[PDB]
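Teaching assistant here, posting this on the class forum so everyone can see the example we discussed in section. The complex has five components, and the goal was to see what a joint structure prediction looks like when all of them are supplied at once.
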Amino acid sequence: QPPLLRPLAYRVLSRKYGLSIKSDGLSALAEFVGTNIGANWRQGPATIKFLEQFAAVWKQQERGLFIDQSGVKEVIQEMKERE
Amino acid sequence: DINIDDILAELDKEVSPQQDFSDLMKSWKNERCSPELLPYPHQLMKRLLNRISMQSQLIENISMGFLDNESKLPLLCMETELERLKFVIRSYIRCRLSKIDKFSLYLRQLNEDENSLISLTDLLSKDEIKYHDTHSLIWLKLVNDSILKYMPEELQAINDTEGSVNMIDEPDWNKFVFIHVNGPPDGKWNEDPLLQENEFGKPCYTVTIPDLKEEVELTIGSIYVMRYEVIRDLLRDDKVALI
Amino acid sequence: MSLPAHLQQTFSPEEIQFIVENEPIKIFPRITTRQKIRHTRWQLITTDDKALNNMVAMRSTEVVLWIALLLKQQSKCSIVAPQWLTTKELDRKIQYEKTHPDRFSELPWNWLVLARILFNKAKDDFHDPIHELRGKIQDLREIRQIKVLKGLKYLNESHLQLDNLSLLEINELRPFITEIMDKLREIHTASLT
Amino acid sequence: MYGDLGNKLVLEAKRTKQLYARSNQDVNLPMYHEDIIRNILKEVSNLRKNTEYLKEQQQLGMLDDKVAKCQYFVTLLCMERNKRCLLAYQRLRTDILDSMAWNNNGLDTNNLSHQEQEYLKEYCDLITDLKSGDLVDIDLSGSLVPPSDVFIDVRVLKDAGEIQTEYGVFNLIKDSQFFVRQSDVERLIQQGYLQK
Amino acid sequence: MGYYDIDDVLADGTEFPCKFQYDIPGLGYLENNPGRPITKNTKLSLPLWLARILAIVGPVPFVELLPPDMFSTKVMNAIKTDPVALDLHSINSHFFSLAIKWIMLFSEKELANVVSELLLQRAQELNHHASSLSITNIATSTFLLKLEEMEKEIYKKSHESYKDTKRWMFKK
């Protein structure tokens, strides 16, 4: 249900920092939500961490491209363990 | 002609968010035209921001209901009203931020002056205080490394006021500004001691200009151009509008 | 810096527009929101909501200008022409101007901007021939500009008294007048020991 | 004279200020005149050496009361003039950098001195700190143009594929037009994808 | 004036004729000859930023400010005859600000009066030009050419204001 979090995803990337995001990356964000199947209220901080990594490395609009966003996923996932 | 108008009156004598918006808009005009930074009206913005937050939240609730008559015209009016209010607040905030940057050194010395009649916190708000401090620190580091490290100590001073040109700079109190004489804030005119009738019995707020050593009779409901210094009190008293 | 230079010491025409829209205005709703004693509600914050939820078709009322314009963009509202915006009123003001070259007329502080807005998005409502109204407004503008130049002839450090000058004209002339006054005061003060 | 280099530097500063102001669209600032700054710094160091030797001679007392008085004062004045020139140039560059940050970064690194680059990064950090937290509801980086129009029709200037929205998705297809509320797509317009 | 005001710095850079009242050694570098010693009554033109302070300090000041050409009798005569026709730019780029600086240095009331006149008179035509928006004329072009830097700046500001007024007013 990527569209359900589409409002929050928009406010977290393209309105939180103005980072444009594709819809397929929205579906990938939904799959990552499934990964963190628990309450997604605190997943917002995780999304912001992904945003920070993207703004540090990728730095391209429509970030939710389900592929570049995918790379951001594994990278943030990596650091998420390192920590 | 028994004047019962008082009798009919007494017989009739038997925090509006709209008002808050009007106050904000007046304050924003004053900030835009004022040379000095005006005392941040904390309570007004506090209440306005609270109202904005709750308004946006309930608008989102109506949006959810729509997802779940159904005329959207009021919804559009909400969206535009929030946009306009947010725009005004942003304009005011950015204006005062730029002003802070302009006279950062003047603010620094005022805060440093323990005899300062005003505390920096009184004028700047919390976020403004933080921004001023951090920005001043960053700029200080940049200039330090770029130039001062070469510069000898006697000239390494950044806030120096002894050189031929004082590095610290302050708003021109004497800057001319457009002004309108609002008159007394209330309908009670004789209440205010400053107000007094004049030629043709027209009230004015007479104010001497010391530089020229002259007097000006600013009639109510009129427009004039005066040095900001001469009006500081009246505008602070709200008798006049900083056009 | 948080504020562009062109906005540093004045308001662009757009800000003037906005502050004008903050005002209310007569209108004739083409809708009846007022729910009979026998539902979406506005519930605004910065302006009144009581009237909005009591709209009744073809019943004059006041609303903040921008709401009125929003509705007028739809067919659901009609903007009532302000009384001062009438051939008789404009002619009277013109005659007063010619009668008193020294003084400006008592037009609404927002007459120019309001007239422009209505002309652009309220041509239908205007009862009088719109072209005549535009022409008379232009003539008033010309006369006021001439008087502005005449007043400028007497620019002085002491002070100025624009009196009935309209807000739009004031914003137009702000930079020049303010700067000239500043330089003159600087010179005179420097003369002072 | 020592002030000549500072005069050239401030002339460059004025030229770049006029460059930015005259050009309505934001313009990348010119190259840092590292050579001129280094030369002025060398002059300042030479003046420092001269002042130290002058103090040495004062200990020698070669007509110090007048000769050393005047020489020390003039050296200090020249050094202060150079200081002011450098400060003005650097401050102008800093302010233009801040304008760039507010305009776009909130929403040409080679030209910037590494100190300037660090300062700009810090300024961006500061801005994002401000818009984050209290007052977040309003987007300080948002446009300073009033939102006169509730709804605006827009044609995608550059195709970039579908994009997400709070409650929708916009398919950016070259020469495709959208009728949507201005606020939603203002960021895209600032990004140049959208026209009118 | 602001310490970081570009125009202020540039104006201060401008030098003026001056003469020494002492024969200080080790200052011939002011004459581009560090070896030589400065001599009393040495007619030297010096930067404003420097010359000012030198005049202040000395009692007999170390240096005297000579009446500069820009404030020559000829200049005031021309100003009084015709402000507008005068090419203030030719006589100097920053004539006004420097005149204010002079008046501050010496309270020369007549000079202030002449400057105030010049300012008002030229400002009248400057406003006329700036208001005459083209729906670059040669007349306004030459007026701009005679225009000073500060006059140029104010003209640009006023012209931009008028342009915005027209743009928003005639066009949506």
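For the discussion questions: Residues 5 and 39 of chain D are 8 Å apart (CA to CA). Chain D has five helices and five strands. Think about how each of these relates to the inputs above.
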